[PDB]
Design a protein around this ligand. Structure first.
Ligand SMILES: CN(C)c1cccc2c(S(=O)(=O)N[C@@H](CC(N)=O)C(=O)O)cccc12
Ligand SMILES: CN(C)c1cccc2c(S(=O)(=O)N[C@@H](CC(N)=O)C(=O)O)cccc12
Ligand SMILES: CCCCCCCCCCCCCC(=O)O
Ligand SMILES: CCCCCCCCCCCCCC(=O)O
Ligand SMILES: CCCCCCCCCCCCCC(=O)O
Ligand SMILES: CCCCCCCCCCCCCC(=O)O
Ligand SMILES: CCCCCCCCCCCCCC(=O)O
Ligand SMILES: CCCCCCCCCCCCCC(=O)O
Length: 582
C-alpha cells in the first residue's frame, strides 16, 4: 500500500522482522560489532511501528531500498572501517544499492567460529536466550553474505529447539552435540548447493539452468502440464538470477510472488502443496522449495511413441529446438523421480546430439530409431556404483568404508595433500551412511545432492592449491560430466613413491588418551602415507599391515608402561611391514 515497510512489518510480525533486519545489516556491514547492529535494528523497528500507526507518517512512503540505504549511510565510522564502500553513499538510488552489492565480501577474514563447551552454551542460553541466539545469528550471517536471510532464520529456530530440548536433558552433551553437528552439516550443504547453482548460472549460462529446473521440477510436479512447468521454470530462473546477484529485497519479492502463484494454482501443480500453502508467509516459500515429489499419473504413454516412433520428430524439433528438448526432459523426468537430475540432463544431451546428426540424413527415422538403446549404459552406470558401494558399506561399517575409499583414491591421485585426502574420503564415507539407509528408489537423488557438495568443496581447495591436471579437468568440465569424470580417474602409474620417513610411522601412547575422532584420523593419516610410500601394495598386503597395526595399538594401550611398548613394538611393526611390502 502507501507504506512498504509497514506492510512488511504486518506480514512478518515483529519477532521475524527484527531477526531479518539484523541478518540483513550483518550481511552488508560485516565488520561492525554486534552492539552497533542491535541499535540499527531497534531504530528501524521503532520507525516501522511509526508507519504501522500512521501510513502517511514522514519517510514511510519511501521504498525499502532507499530506507535501507539511508540507514547504512548513517554509520559514521563507515569510511574509516569500510573505506571505499563509503563512496557508495554519494551515489543516488538505484545506483547506490548496486554499489553496496559490489562490496559484499563473499569471503571476509574473520576467525573461525569455535564451539564453546556444552555447559557454557546451555548456561548462557538459560541466562539470556535472546542475545545468545541473536549474537550467533549475527556471527553466522556476517560470515555468509549470500546465504538467503529467511533461510538463515529457519535454522535459528531449529537451533533454539535443540537447546530447549537438550539443556534440560540428563546428559546434555549426548543430546545436543549430535544435533549441532547435524545442523552444521545441513547448513554447509545448503550453502554449497546455493553457491553451486549461482556459479552454474554464471558460467554455463541461462539455458543450462533452465534445463536443470525443467528436470527437477518435472520430477516434483509430475501431474503438472508442460505449459505450467515452463512458466514455473521461467519465474524460478528469474528468482535465482536476482537472488544470486545478492539483492535480498528483490530476491524476497520474486520468491513471495512465485509462492503465492503456485498456491493459487496448487490444484493444477501438485497435491503435496496443501500443507505448505497454509503455513506463514515466511515458510510457504521454503516448504514449497523442498516439497516431496507428488505421485506420478498412472496412465502415462511410452516415451518412444512421441520421441522415437512418430515420423514428425525432426519436423517438431526444427520448429523449436529447445522447447522440443524441453518436452523430452519433462516427459522423461516425470516418469523417473528415481533418477538424479544430472543423469536426466545427460540423457537429454545424448538425445540432442543424436537428433542433430540424424535429422540431417537421408532417412531420419532409421538413424535415430535405436536411441533409447543408447541410454541404457548411461543409466546403468550410476545405479551399479550405488549398489556396489552401498553393499560394501553394509559389510564394513562407516569407518572401514572410509578407509577403503582412502586406499582407492590415494592411489588414483597420489599428489593431493594427505589432510585433503583424509577429509574428502571421510565426507564421501558419510554420504554412504546417509544415502544407503534409503530404498533403491531414493538413492540416486540423495547421493547427487550430497556428492555435489563434497565435490566442489574438493575443487575449491584444489583451485587454490593446484596439484593435478586430471583433477582440474574434472573440476572445470561441464557440471553434468563432473562426477563421471572423477569416477573415470584411473590409478596413477606415473607416480613415484614418497621416500620413507621414519617419523611418519612412529606412534606414541598419546594415541590412547585421544578421542575417537582424533584417533581415527591419526590412523587414517598414517594409512594415506603408507599407500603414498608403497602405491603398488595390494588390498591383501595392506590389509595385513592394518590388522597388525590394529593389534599393535590395542595391545600397547592396555599394557603397563605405554611409551616403552609403542617404541619397542613400533620398531618391530615398521621393520616387519617394510619386509612384507618389499
Ligand atoms: C545452518 N548453517 C547456517 C550453519 C550453522 C552452523 C555452522 C555453519 C558453518 S561452519 O562455520 O561450521 N564451517 C565453515 C566455516 C568455518 N568457520 O569453519 C566451513 O567449514 O565451510 C558453515 C555454513 C553453515 C553453517
Ligand atoms: C518457493 N519458490 C519461490 C521457490 C524458491 C526456490 C526454489 C524452488 C524450487 S527448487 O526445485 O529449485 N528447490 C531447490 C531447493 C532450493 N535450493 O531452494 C532444490 O531442490 O534444489 C522449486 C519450487 C519453488 C522454489
Ligand atoms: C543459524 C543461526 C543460529 C545460531 C545458533 C548457533 C549456536 C551454536 C553455536 C555453535 C557454532 C559453532 C559452529 C559448529 O557447530 O561447529
Ligand atoms: C524451456 C526448455 C529449456 C531447456 C532446454 C533443454 C536442453 C537440454 C540439453 C541439456 C544441456 C546440458 C547443459 C549443460 O551443459 O550443463
Ligand atoms: C528496511 C529493512 C527491510 C526489511 C527486509 C526484510 C524483507 C523480507 C521480506 C520477506 C519475504 C519472504 C519471502 C520468501 O518467502 O522467501
Ligand atoms: C558414496 C556413494 C557413491 C555414490 C555413487 C555415485 C552415484 C552418483 C549419481 C549422480 C550422477 O548421476 O552422477
Ligand atoms: C580426490 C579423489 C577424487 C574424489 C572422487 C569422488 C567421486 C565419487 C564417485 C564414486 C567413484 O566412482 O569413485
Ligand atoms: C612402512 C611400514 C609402516 C607401517 C605403519 C602402519 C600404518 C598403517 C595403519 C593404518 C591404520 C589401519 C586402520 C585401522 O586400524 O582402523
Amino acid at each position: 500500500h502507501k507504506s512498504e515497510v509497514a506492510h512488511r512489518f504486518k506480514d512478518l510480525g515483529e519477532e521475524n522482522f527484527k531477526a531479518l533486519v539484523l541478518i540483513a545489516f550483518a550481511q552488508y556491514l560485516q565488520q561492525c560489532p554486534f552492539e552497533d547492529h542491535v541499535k540499527l535494528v531497534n531504530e528501524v523497528t521503532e520507525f516501522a511501528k511509526t508507519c504501522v500507526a500512521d501510513e502517511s507518517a514522514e519517510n514511510c512512503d519511501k521504498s525499502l531500498h532507499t530506507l535501507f540505504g539511508d540507514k547504512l549511510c548513517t554509520v559514521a565510522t563507515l569510511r574509516e572501517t569500510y573505506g571505499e564502500m563509503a563512496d557508495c553513499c554519494a551515489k543516488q538510488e538505484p545506483e547506490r544499492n548496486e554499489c553496496f552489492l559490489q562490496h559484499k565480501d563473499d569471503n571476509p577474514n574473520l576467525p573461525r567460529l569455535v564451539r564453546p563447551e556444552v555447559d557454557v552454551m546451555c548456561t548462557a542460553f538459560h541466562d539470556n536466550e535472546e542475545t545468545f541466539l541473536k549474537k550467533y545469528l549475527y556471527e553466522i550471517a556476517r560470515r555468509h553474505p549470500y546465504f538467503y536471510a529467511p533461510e538463515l532464520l529457519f535454522f535459528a529456530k531449529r537451533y533454539k529447539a535443540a537447546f530447549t530440548e537438550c539443556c534440560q536433558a540428563a546428559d546434555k552433551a549426548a543430546c545436543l552435540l549430535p544435533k549441532l553437528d547435524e545442523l552444521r552439516d545441513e547448513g554447509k550443504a545448503s550453502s554449497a548447493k546455493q553457491r553451486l547453482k549461482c556459479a552454474s548460472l554464471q558460467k554455463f549460462g541461462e539455458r543450462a539452468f533452465k534445463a536443470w529446473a525443467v528436470a527437477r521440477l518435472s520430477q516434483r510436479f509430475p501431474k503438472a502440464e508442460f505449459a505450467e512447468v515452463s512458466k514455473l521454470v521461467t519465474d524460478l530462473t528469474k528468482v535465482h538470477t536476482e537472488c544470486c546477484h545478492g539483492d535480498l529485497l528483490e530476491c524476497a519479492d520474486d520468491r513471495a510472488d512465485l509462492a503465492k502463484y503456485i498456491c493459487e494454482n496448487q490444484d493444477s501443480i501438485s497435491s503435496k502443496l496443501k500443507e505448505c500453502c497454509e503455513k506463514p508467509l515466511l515458510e510457504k516459500s521454503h516448504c514449497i522449495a523442498e516439497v516431496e515429489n507428488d505421485e506420478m499419473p498412472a496412465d502415462l504413454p511410452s516415451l518412444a511413441a512421441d520421441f522415437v516412433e512418430s515420423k514428425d520428430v525432426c519436423k517438431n524439433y526444427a520448429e523449436a529446438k529447445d522447447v522440443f528438448l524441453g518436452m523430452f526432459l519433462y516427459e522423461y523426468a516425470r516418469r523417473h523421480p528415481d533418477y538424479s537430475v544430472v543423469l536426466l540432463l545427460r540423457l537429454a544431451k545424448t538425445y540432442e546430439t543424436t537428433l542433430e546428426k540424424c535429422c540431417a540424413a537421408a532417412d531420419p527415422h532409421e538413424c535415430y530409431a535405436k536411441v533409447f538403446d543408447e541410454f541404457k549404459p548411461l543409466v546403468e552406470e550410476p545405479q551399479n556404483l550405488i549398489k556396489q558401494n552401498c553393499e560394501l558399506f553394509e559389510q564394513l561399517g562407516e569407518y572401514k568404508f572410509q578407509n577403503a575409499l582412502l586406499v582407492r583414491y590415494t592411489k588414483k591421485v597420489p599428489q593431493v595433500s594427505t589432510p585433503t585426502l583424509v577429509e574428502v574420503s571421510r565426507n564421501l564415507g558419510k554420504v554412504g551412511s546417509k544415502c544407503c539407509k534409503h530404498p533403491e528408489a531414493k538413492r540416486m537423488p540423495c547421493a547427487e545432492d550430497y556428492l555435489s557438495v563434497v565435490l566442489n568443496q574438493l575443487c575449491v581447495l584444489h583451485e587454490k592449491t593446484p596439484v593435478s591436471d586430471r583433477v582440474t579437468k574434472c573440476c572445470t568440465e561441464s557440471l553434468v560430466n563432473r562426477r563421471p569424470c572423477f569416477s573415470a580417474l584411473e590409478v596413477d602409474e606415473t607416480y613415484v613413491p614418497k621416500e620413507f620417513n621414519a617419523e611418519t610411522f612412529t606412534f606414541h601412547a598419546d594415541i590412547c588418551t585421544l578421542s575417537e575422532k582424533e584417533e581415527q584420523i591419526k590412523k587414517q593419516t598414517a594409512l594415506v602415507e603408507l599407500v603414498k610410500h608403497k602405491p603398488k601394495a595390494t588390498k591383501e598386503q595392506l590389509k595385513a599391515v592394518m590388522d597388525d597395526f590394529a593389534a599393535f595399538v590395542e595391545k600397547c594401550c592396555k599394557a603397563d608402561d605405554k611409551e616403552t611398548c609403542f617404541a619397542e613394538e613400533g620398531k618391530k611393526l615398521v621393520a616387519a611391514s617394510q619386509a612384507a611390502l618389499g
